[PDB]
Design a protein around this ligand. Structure first.
Ligand code: FES
Ligand SMILES: [K+]
Ligand SMILES: [K+]
Ligand SMILES: [Mg+2]
Ligand SMILES: [Mg+2]
Ligand SMILES: [Mg+2]
Ligand SMILES: [Mg+2]
Ligand SMILES: [Mg+2]
Ligand SMILES: [Mg+2]
Ligand SMILES: [Mg+2]
Ligand SMILES: [Mg+2]
Ligand SMILES: [Mg+2]
Ligand SMILES: [Mg+2]
Lengths: 37, 106, 95, 122, 51, 50, 44, 354, 55
RNA sequence: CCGAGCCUGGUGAUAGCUGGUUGUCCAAGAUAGAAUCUUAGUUCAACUUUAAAUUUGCCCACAGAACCCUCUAAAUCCCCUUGUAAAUUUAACUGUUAGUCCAAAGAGGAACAGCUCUUUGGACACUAGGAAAAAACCUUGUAGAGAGAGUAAAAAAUUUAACA
RNA sequence: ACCUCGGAGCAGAACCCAACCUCCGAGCAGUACAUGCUAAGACUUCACCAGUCAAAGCGAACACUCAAUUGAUCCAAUAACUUGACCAACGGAACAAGUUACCCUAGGGAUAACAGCGCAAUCCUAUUCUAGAGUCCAUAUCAACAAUAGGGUUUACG
């Protein structure tokens, strides 16, 4: 198929693994700010 | 139409290549590369080496011949201080013209 | 090509090759240029210069013409005052 | 079109935080490499296959020693995703003529010149 | 890198030049093996028998 | 989005891997992926990709 | 060559040229010079 | 992929905003003059001068000549301006200049040229022949004192030697007339060497004349260290150049180590190097004049080798490299029949075993 | 495809027998050129004799 | 079995078409094209094989390859070192070229098709493991025996609406 | 309609690179009359055949323009030099059209129709949007420009 398609074209498995590994991970504080005074 | 194949025209001798007299250096439809030192140009703008040596490509100031009216009218409309440049291919001679050898003792 | 004749049982020679080609004993085949007498008024002197020249056939063409001729045409001849006598043997040839 | 890759020079620029992480010293770089192929040349371009042969990395998991020089490093940067690179360390120094038969390359990258096969008395 | 491009240049020219000369020697030494007269005569042993 | 890139705890990013040709990943990528940096796939734009 | 640092050294057309009058300048003026003497009109 | 330039662009200074209000060349000559100036400037890209221009060392060539004369520019300029006004005052000069009938006297111009800028032009002209490159290994000197050398041909004609003029050995069979302006009580040293006259060592030179401790202009009274020997360029060896070197002595100098027997017909003793000779005498001796000429082979050269030198005259010839032919192939495709003649040695028929 | 020009044969006036073919316009007088004759190794007058074809 | 009877002979007619093409073992070994009353074929080249000769071959540091033209592209060509061991020429001929799918760039169709047509690369027609079964995805190749060992790829996530 | 040859885009930077492709053409004319004779070394439309450039030398003066502007062998004509085909099916057979459902043979799922399968332009259905009809009133009903998904019943495409 074409490079750009109207529907979401399925990624190659190697590319899909790359996307899953390189996902944003928000920083996690040691203690939740709400619980601290 | 438009089924014509490519003419296989381009650089035949790259930078630093050793060439002999008569070797074709570059084939071009238009003057992409201009003949330099010891480089001849044929009817079809074919650049051939006039001497045996090493091929060099440099950027040189382009001063067109006064008889060539079209190119003269181009430099006369340039702003003062502007200078045109073009790529020139040169052949640096490697061997000397000859040597003096002893042949007899009279 | 007739590999075995019907009356002698021997290989024949294609006369088209003999008339159109000349074989030197060194193995080279000398031919003419196709079109050296056709429409000479529309051809440049440089083009006509290489049309009236005698050229050598390459390896594939030479091997083809060696099978279409018998051994009588590969023998060494000693014609008196032969224009191509000096070209029947190679000199200073390596590999 | 898929073609070769031009790796930017900034990629091979170790940061100060990397010298405290991998134990290397930029002032005194190691002399020899320990290259080991850990990936198949199959399903990879032909130019990567040729470089593997030039480096003597035919058989997988077979350590090879190469010199840390730019020309050799140039070939490594092409197949850097198919090999494992470790420095060669010499705790006892370069093997001599009398220590050729007693060498052994451990998994840590160190080449010992006295392979005694004997438990340490300490 | 242990050495720069300038330092590395020419440090293995002799070894590389000698390595190819060994390839040339092996390539130019290809010739049919010697034929001994003992081997030809040893085929007559097929008819060796007891008296 | 600029904040997300700075505080991202993932040590691996699309830009780093694609540019350096890590794992030979450029065999399944596109020349545009060196500039899109994984945020664009076809005509679709992914705002959550860092 | 384009990748070379000397790319574009031969470019020349950007140095060659390919009316409305604003509130600060006069757009078009025709200076008519009428005289019965042809030499005086040509000379001026 | 684009790489930023290593330096300023040739036409970067031109502003493209007000292109219509910029003065153009409007002529071919105006562009050519500007084109030449930039062609002589260094550039960060590859240029013709890089591969074909003669490479020169960053070190400036040292000067071993006399100090320049002291001239008051203000007084010198004042007289010149007045002389021009007097010349322009005459209406006859203007009429001759307007009618294009006036002319200048060549002899008077050269006499003034020889004293004002003659030494500087000769120094530049000497560099073209590579005299400083060979005699002094690049060291230059201004010929402050002009040297007048002329050979007596017959009894009334003279052949002057200014700078590289053609002189035949027949005209140079005897010692020439040497004259120069000098003060009384000064000591001078004449020298004549052939740079390319050597037959064995390319670097070494042959000594033809050496006069030392010359009192003023009296050349004859000077010591005859080396007898005069006519130039002997071998036939077919090209054009040789012989340079006259005139030195000014600060104190009397003893040339016992450089003394040569009279006559000196051995080329081993005639061997002479200007660099080493001046190296051991640079303290008390300084070059003052310079003159040189080019010499060809003629019939008189045969006299020198046979009678004087007592040897066979060597004959040279200009030999060119053999023509290049590609490696011969068994089957030359699309090649003319004359291809075989290119690789054939003998033009006479061969028969082999027959 | 009207034949604007024709191909004619020029015969040397020197009697050497040398001849060459040239192209000329149909609506024109017979040419009289001054061409080089290799037989005498100098330029000799040539005159059109017979038309060969139409171009 | 009559749009031209049957039989014999020419006749082993011819068929670029269909089918078949018999013992063992080992080795090398796949996808540029041009011409063709030619695209169901053939010839040449490319590729492949053996033998032989010879010396460079491949990888590639700078330098170098256009202007009218900023899709200012990915990247090539050239190319000493260097890593390596092939390459060229000579001799003798066969055979393959109705290809597929995946990734990528770009065309035609409808920003459809297991669609068509080029380019780069991979795999497949060569083994094995894993994706459920699986020619084209991933892992992995040079070959045997073992009732030893270490590993490669390799198991989908997700449950959503009160309100002054 | 098309068949040969050339330029531009695809094919962005050495070369090369296809259609049913996207566009424009060429089957000449003009000036020469040394547009003469010879000869190193090279290019080459992916083979061959053809095609292109060319220093020096001899001889004269003091390798014509043009992207294409072209046709091989045999043969005929000719004293000779040279010339001859919209052979345009343009690598060209010296000269041969229809029809067959009366048809025959050898094959082909490389290849059609029916079918199966792929695909969802068309078709079909439900939501989203709230403009607009429904006396007033979006939402009793109905519905525009569109959007978001599903279905594989038609017409097409492969
Ligand atoms: S759990 Fe800490 S505020 Fe409630
Ligand atoms: K067929
Ligand atoms: K045909
Ligand atoms: Mg695609
Ligand atoms: Mg085209
Ligand atoms: Mg019957
Ligand atoms: Mg049969
Ligand atoms: Mg095998
Ligand atoms: Mg035909
Ligand atoms: Mg070719
Ligand atoms: Mg055809
Ligand atoms: Mg053709
Ligand atoms: Mg009917």
């Amino acid at each position: 198929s074409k490079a750009v398609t109207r529907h979401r074209r399925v990624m190659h498995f190697q590319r899909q693994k790359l996307m899953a590994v390189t996902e944003y991970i928000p920083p996690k504080p040691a203690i939740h700010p709400s619980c601290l005074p | 139409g438009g089924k014509s194949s490519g003419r296989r025209q381009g650089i035949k001798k790259m930078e630093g290549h050793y060439v002999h007299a008569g070797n074709i250096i570059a084939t071009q439809r238009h003057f992409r590369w201009h003949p330099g030192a010891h480089v001849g140009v044929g009817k079809n703008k074919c650049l051939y080496a006039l001497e045996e040596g090493i091929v060099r490509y440099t950027k040189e100031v382009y001063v067109p011949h006064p008889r060539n009216t079209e190119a003269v009218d181009l430099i006369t409309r340039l702003p003062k201080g502007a200078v045109l440049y073009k790529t020139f291919v040169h052949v640096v001679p490697a061997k000397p013209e000859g040597t003096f050898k002893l042949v007899a003792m009279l | 090509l007739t590999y075995f004749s019907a009356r002698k049982g021997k290989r024949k020679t294609v006369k088209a090759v003999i008339d159109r080609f000349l074989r030197l004993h060194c193995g080279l085949w000398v031919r003419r240029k196709a079109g050296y007498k056709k429409k000479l008024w529309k051809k440049t002197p440089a083009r006509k210069k290489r049309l009236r020249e005698f050229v050598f056939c390459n390896k594939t063409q030479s091997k083809l013409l060696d099978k279409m001729t018998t051994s009588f045409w590969k023998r060494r001849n000693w014609y008196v005052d032969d224009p191509y006598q000096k070209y029947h043997d190679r000199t200073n040839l390596k590999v | 079109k898929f073609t070769r890759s031009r790796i930017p020079e900034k990629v091979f620029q170790a940061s100060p935080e990397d010298h405290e992480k991998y134990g290397g010293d930029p002032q005194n770089p190691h002399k020899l490499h320990i290259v080991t192929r850990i990936k198949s040349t199959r399903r990879r371009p032909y130019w990567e296959k040729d470089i593997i042969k030039m480096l003597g990395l035919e058989k997988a998991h077979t350590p090879q020693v190469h010199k840390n020089i730019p020309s050799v490093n140039a070939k490594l940067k092409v197949v850097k995703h198919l090999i494992r690179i470790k420095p060669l360390k010499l705790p006892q120094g370069l093997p001599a003529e009398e220590n050729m038969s007693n060498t052994c390359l451990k998994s840590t990258g160190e080449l010992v010149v006295q392979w005694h096969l004997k438990p340490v008395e300490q | 890198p242990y050495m720069t491009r300038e330092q590395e240049r020419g440090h293995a020219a002799v070894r590389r030049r000698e390595a190819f000369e060994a390839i040339k020697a092996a390539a130019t030494s290809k010739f049919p093996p010697h034929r001994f007269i003992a081997d030809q005569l040893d085929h007559l042993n097929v008819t060796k028998k007891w008296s | 989005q600029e904040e997300r890139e700075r505080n991202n705890q993932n040590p691996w990013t699309f830009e780093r891997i694609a540019t350096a040709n890590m794992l030979g990943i450029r065999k399944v990528l596109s020349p545009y992926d060196l500039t899109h940096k994984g945020k664009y796939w076809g005509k679709f734009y992914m705002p959550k990709r860092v | 060559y384009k990748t070379k640092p000397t790319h574009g050294i031969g470019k020349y057309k950007h140095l060659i040229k390919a009316n409305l009058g604003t509130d600060y300048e006069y757009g078009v003026l025709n200076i008519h010079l009428t005289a019965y003497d042809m030499t005086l009109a040509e000379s001026y | 992929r684009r790489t930023p330039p290593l330096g300023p662009m040739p036409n970067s200074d031109i502003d493209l905003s007000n292109l219509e209000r910029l003065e153009k060349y409007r002529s071919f000559d105006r562009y050519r003059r500007r084109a030449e100036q930039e062609a002589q400037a260094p550039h960060w890209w590859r240029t013709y001068r890089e591969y074909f221009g003669e490479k020169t060392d960053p070190k400036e060539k040292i000067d071993i000549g006399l100090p320049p004369p002291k001239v008051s520019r203000t007084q010198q300029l004042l007289e010149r301006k007045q002389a021009i006004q007097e010349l322009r005052a005459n209406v006859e000069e203007e009429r001759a200049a307007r009618l294009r009938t006036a002319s200048v006297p060549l002899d008077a111009v050269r006499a003034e040229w020889e004293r004002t800028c003659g030494p500087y032009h000769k120094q530049r002209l000497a560099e073209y022949y590579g005299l400083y490159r060979d005699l002094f290994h690049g060291a230059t000197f201004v010929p402050r004192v002009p040297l007048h050398v002329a050979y007596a041909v017959g009894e009334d004609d003279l052949m002057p030697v200014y700078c590289g003029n053609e002189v035949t050995p027949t005209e140079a069979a005897q010692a020439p007339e040497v004259t120069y302006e000098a003060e009384e009580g000064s000591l001078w040293t004449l020298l004549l060497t052939s740079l390319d006259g050597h037959l064995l060592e390319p670097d070494a030179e042959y000594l033809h004349w050496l006069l030392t401790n010359i009192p003023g202009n009296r050349v004859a009274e000077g010591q005859v260290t080396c007898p005069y020997l006519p130039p002997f360029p071998a036939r077919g060896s090209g054009i040789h150049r012989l340079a006259f070197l005139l030195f000014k002595q600060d104190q009397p100098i003893d040339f016992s180590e450089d003394a040569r027997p009279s006559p000196c017909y051995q080329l081993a003793q005639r061997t002479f190097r200007t660099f080493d000779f001046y190296k051991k005498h640079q303290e008390t001796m300084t070059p003052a004049g310079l003159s040189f000429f080019q010499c060809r082979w003629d019939d008189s050269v045969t006299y020198i080798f046979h009678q004087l030198l007592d040897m066979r005259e060597p004959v040279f010839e200009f030999v060119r490299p053999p023509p290049y032919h590609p490696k011969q192939k068994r089957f030359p495709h699309r090649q003319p029949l004359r291809y075989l003649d290119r690789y054939r040695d003998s033009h006479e028929p061969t028969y082999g075993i027959y | 495809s009207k034949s604007k020009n024709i191909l004619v044969r020029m015969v040397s006036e020197a009697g050497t027998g040398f001849c060459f073919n040239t192209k000329r316009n149909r609506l024109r007088e017979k040419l009289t050129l001054l061409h080089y004759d290799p037989v005498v190794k100098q330029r000799v007058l040539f005159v059109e004799k017979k038309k060969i074809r139409s171009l």
